[PDB]
Design a protein around this ligand. Structure first.
Ligand code: NA
Length: 207
Protein backbone atom coordinates (compact mmCIF):
# COMPACT_ATOMS: atom_id res chain seq x y z
CA UNK A 1 0.00 0.00 0.00
CA UNK A 2 1.03 3.62 -0.61
CA UNK A 3 0.47 6.21 2.12
CA UNK A 4 0.95 9.94 1.50
CA UNK A 5 1.62 11.90 4.69
CA UNK A 6 0.83 15.60 4.26
CA UNK A 7 1.58 18.34 6.80
CA UNK A 8 -0.92 21.17 6.35
CA UNK A 9 -0.21 22.60 9.81
CA UNK A 10 1.41 26.02 10.03
CA UNK A 11 4.13 24.47 12.23
CA UNK A 12 6.67 21.72 11.67
CA UNK A 13 5.75 18.17 12.67
CA UNK A 14 7.81 14.99 12.76
CA UNK A 15 5.77 12.13 11.33
CA UNK A 16 6.08 8.55 12.53
CA UNK A 17 4.94 5.17 11.24
CA UNK A 18 5.38 2.01 13.32
CA UNK A 19 3.72 -1.37 13.83
CA UNK A 20 4.92 -1.74 17.43
CA UNK A 21 7.94 -4.00 16.89
CA UNK A 22 9.41 -2.45 13.72
CA UNK A 23 9.40 0.76 11.72
CA UNK A 24 7.15 1.34 8.71
CA UNK A 25 9.28 2.43 5.74
CA UNK A 26 11.84 4.94 7.11
CA UNK A 27 10.00 5.12 10.46
CA UNK A 28 9.90 8.90 10.74
CA UNK A 29 10.74 12.17 9.06
CA UNK A 30 10.56 15.92 9.55
CA UNK A 31 7.59 17.54 7.78
CA UNK A 32 7.71 21.30 7.36
CA UNK A 33 4.52 23.24 6.65
CA UNK A 34 3.16 21.85 3.37
CA UNK A 35 5.65 18.99 2.90
CA UNK A 36 4.41 15.57 1.81
CA UNK A 37 5.97 12.20 2.63
CA UNK A 38 5.29 9.09 0.54
CA UNK A 39 5.86 5.68 2.13
CA UNK A 40 5.11 2.08 1.17
CA UNK A 41 3.51 -0.26 3.71
CA UNK A 42 3.99 -3.95 2.97
CA UNK A 43 0.63 -5.63 2.22
CA UNK A 44 -0.69 -7.56 5.20
CA UNK A 45 0.70 -5.14 7.79
CA UNK A 46 -1.36 -5.64 10.94
CA UNK A 47 -1.63 -3.03 13.67
CA UNK A 48 0.26 -0.22 11.97
CA UNK A 49 -0.06 3.32 13.29
CA UNK A 50 0.81 6.75 11.90
CA UNK A 51 1.03 9.81 14.13
CA UNK A 52 2.65 13.23 14.44
CA UNK A 53 5.27 14.52 16.87
CA UNK A 54 5.65 18.15 17.92
CA UNK A 55 8.60 20.21 19.18
CA UNK A 56 11.44 17.80 18.46
CA UNK A 57 15.21 18.21 18.65
CA UNK A 58 17.40 15.52 17.07
CA UNK A 59 21.15 14.97 16.90
CA UNK A 60 23.11 13.86 13.83
CA UNK A 61 22.63 10.21 14.84
CA UNK A 62 18.84 10.67 14.86
CA UNK A 63 18.59 10.63 18.66
CA UNK A 64 16.69 13.33 20.53
CA UNK A 65 13.27 13.98 22.08
CA UNK A 66 9.82 15.35 21.25
CA UNK A 67 7.32 16.97 23.60
CA UNK A 68 4.54 14.77 22.20
CA UNK A 69 4.64 11.37 20.50
CA UNK A 70 8.27 10.65 21.39
CA UNK A 71 9.23 7.12 20.34
CA UNK A 72 12.25 6.41 22.52
CA UNK A 73 14.15 9.50 21.41
CA UNK A 74 14.63 8.33 17.82
CA UNK A 75 13.83 10.23 14.64
CA UNK A 76 13.09 6.98 12.78
CA UNK A 77 10.58 5.26 15.06
CA UNK A 78 10.71 1.52 15.67
CA UNK A 79 8.03 1.81 18.38
CA UNK A 80 4.76 3.59 19.10
CA UNK A 81 5.00 7.06 20.62
CA UNK A 82 4.44 8.49 24.08
CA UNK A 83 0.92 9.94 24.57
CA UNK A 84 -0.79 12.24 23.89
CA UNK A 85 -0.96 11.23 20.21
CA UNK A 86 -3.76 11.31 17.68
CA UNK A 87 -3.47 7.90 16.06
CA UNK A 88 -4.11 6.80 12.49
CA UNK A 89 -4.57 3.04 12.78
CA UNK A 90 -4.77 0.54 9.94
CA UNK A 91 -4.79 -3.20 9.29
CA UNK A 92 -4.27 -4.18 5.66
CA UNK A 93 -5.20 -7.21 3.55
CA UNK A 94 -7.29 -8.95 6.22
CA UNK A 95 -9.33 -11.42 4.15
CA UNK A 96 -9.64 -9.06 1.20
CA UNK A 97 -10.35 -5.95 3.28
CA UNK A 98 -8.44 -3.02 4.73
CA UNK A 99 -9.50 -1.55 8.08
CA UNK A 100 -8.77 2.06 9.04
CA UNK A 101 -9.75 4.28 11.94
CA UNK A 102 -8.73 7.32 13.97
CA UNK A 103 -8.21 6.89 17.71
CA UNK A 104 -8.12 9.29 20.66
CA UNK A 105 -7.57 6.34 23.03
CA UNK A 106 -3.99 7.58 23.56
CA UNK A 107 -4.86 11.28 23.68
CA UNK A 108 -4.79 14.03 21.09
CA UNK A 109 -2.13 16.46 19.91
CA UNK A 110 -2.55 17.36 16.22
CA UNK A 111 -5.73 17.55 14.09
CA UNK A 112 -5.88 14.71 11.60
CA UNK A 113 -7.71 13.47 8.53
CA UNK A 114 -7.35 9.87 7.32
CA UNK A 115 -8.83 9.27 3.87
CA UNK A 116 -8.25 6.79 1.04
CA UNK A 117 -6.71 7.93 -2.23
CA UNK A 118 -8.71 5.25 -4.08
CA UNK A 119 -12.32 4.09 -4.37
CA UNK A 120 -14.45 1.75 -2.28
CA UNK A 121 -14.81 3.50 1.10
CA UNK A 122 -14.94 6.81 2.96
CA UNK A 123 -12.55 8.73 5.19
CA UNK A 124 -12.50 9.76 8.84
CA UNK A 125 -11.40 13.04 10.40
CA UNK A 126 -10.78 14.49 13.86
CA UNK A 127 -10.09 18.21 13.39
CA UNK A 128 -11.74 19.73 16.47
CA UNK A 129 -9.83 21.98 18.87
CA UNK A 130 -9.50 19.24 21.47
CA UNK A 131 -6.37 20.87 22.89
CA UNK A 132 -8.16 24.20 23.30
CA UNK A 133 -11.13 22.58 25.03
CA UNK A 134 -9.10 19.97 26.92
CA UNK A 135 -10.10 19.61 30.59
CA UNK A 136 -7.51 20.91 33.03
CA UNK A 137 -6.79 17.49 34.54
CA UNK A 138 -6.00 16.05 31.09
CA UNK A 139 -3.93 18.94 29.70
CA UNK A 140 -0.34 17.98 28.87
CA UNK A 141 2.35 20.62 29.56
CA UNK A 142 4.32 19.76 26.43
CA UNK A 143 1.08 20.13 24.47
CA UNK A 144 -1.92 18.02 23.59
CA UNK A 145 -4.75 16.46 25.57
CA UNK A 146 -4.07 13.25 27.49
CA UNK A 147 -6.46 10.32 27.72
CA UNK A 148 -7.85 9.35 31.12
CA UNK A 149 -6.01 6.00 31.16
CA UNK A 150 -2.59 7.63 30.70
CA UNK A 151 -3.32 10.08 33.52
CA UNK A 152 -5.06 8.12 36.28
CA UNK A 153 -4.14 4.47 35.53
CA UNK A 154 -7.43 2.95 36.67
CA UNK A 155 -9.10 -0.25 35.52
CA UNK A 156 -12.11 1.75 34.30
CA UNK A 157 -10.22 4.29 32.19
CA UNK A 158 -7.84 1.62 30.85
CA UNK A 159 -10.51 -1.12 30.56
CA UNK A 160 -8.19 -3.75 32.00
CA UNK A 161 -10.76 -6.28 33.25
CA UNK A 162 -12.38 -6.31 29.79
CA UNK A 163 -15.61 -4.53 30.72
CA UNK A 164 -15.81 -0.74 31.01
CA UNK A 165 -18.26 2.00 30.16
CA UNK A 166 -17.92 5.54 28.84
CA UNK A 167 -16.62 8.05 31.38
CA UNK A 168 -16.84 11.82 31.72
CA UNK A 169 -13.50 12.09 29.89
CA UNK A 170 -14.19 9.77 26.94
CA UNK A 171 -17.42 11.66 26.25
CA UNK A 172 -15.37 14.86 25.86
CA UNK A 173 -13.26 13.39 23.05
CA UNK A 174 -16.38 11.74 21.61
CA UNK A 175 -18.48 14.92 21.71
CA UNK A 176 -15.84 16.72 19.61
CA UNK A 177 -14.72 13.83 17.34
CA UNK A 178 -17.52 11.27 16.93
CA UNK A 179 -15.66 9.43 14.15
CA UNK A 180 -12.74 8.53 16.44
CA UNK A 181 -12.33 5.99 19.23
CA UNK A 182 -12.86 7.61 22.63
CA UNK A 183 -12.17 4.50 24.75
CA UNK A 184 -11.33 0.83 24.27
CA UNK A 185 -14.89 -0.55 24.13
CA UNK A 186 -16.20 2.48 22.24
CA UNK A 187 -18.64 1.58 19.49
CA UNK A 188 -16.34 0.89 16.50
CA UNK A 189 -15.92 3.87 14.18
CA UNK A 190 -13.81 1.70 11.86
CA UNK A 191 -14.10 2.05 8.09
CA UNK A 192 -13.82 -0.97 5.80
CA UNK A 193 -11.95 -0.46 2.53
CA UNK A 194 -11.07 -2.80 -0.35
CA UNK A 195 -7.85 -4.70 0.11
CA UNK A 196 -4.69 -3.00 -1.19
CA UNK A 197 -6.17 0.51 -1.11
CA UNK A 198 -3.96 3.59 -0.86
CA UNK A 199 -4.35 6.41 1.64
CA UNK A 200 -3.38 9.97 2.51
CA UNK A 201 -2.85 11.25 6.06
CA UNK A 202 -3.21 15.03 6.41
CA UNK A 203 -2.23 16.89 9.58
CA UNK A 204 -4.35 20.00 10.18
CA UNK A 205 -6.72 19.19 7.28
CA UNK A 206 -8.74 22.41 7.74
CA UNK A 207 -5.73 24.71 8.21
NA1 NA B 1 -6.09 2.74 19.73
Amino acid sequence: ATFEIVNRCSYTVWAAASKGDAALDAGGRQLNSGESWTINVEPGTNGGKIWARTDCYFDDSGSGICKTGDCGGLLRCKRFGRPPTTLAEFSLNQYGKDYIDISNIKGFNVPMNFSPTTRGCRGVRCAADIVGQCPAKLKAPGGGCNDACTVFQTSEYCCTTGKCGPTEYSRFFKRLCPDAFSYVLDKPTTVTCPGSSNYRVTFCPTA
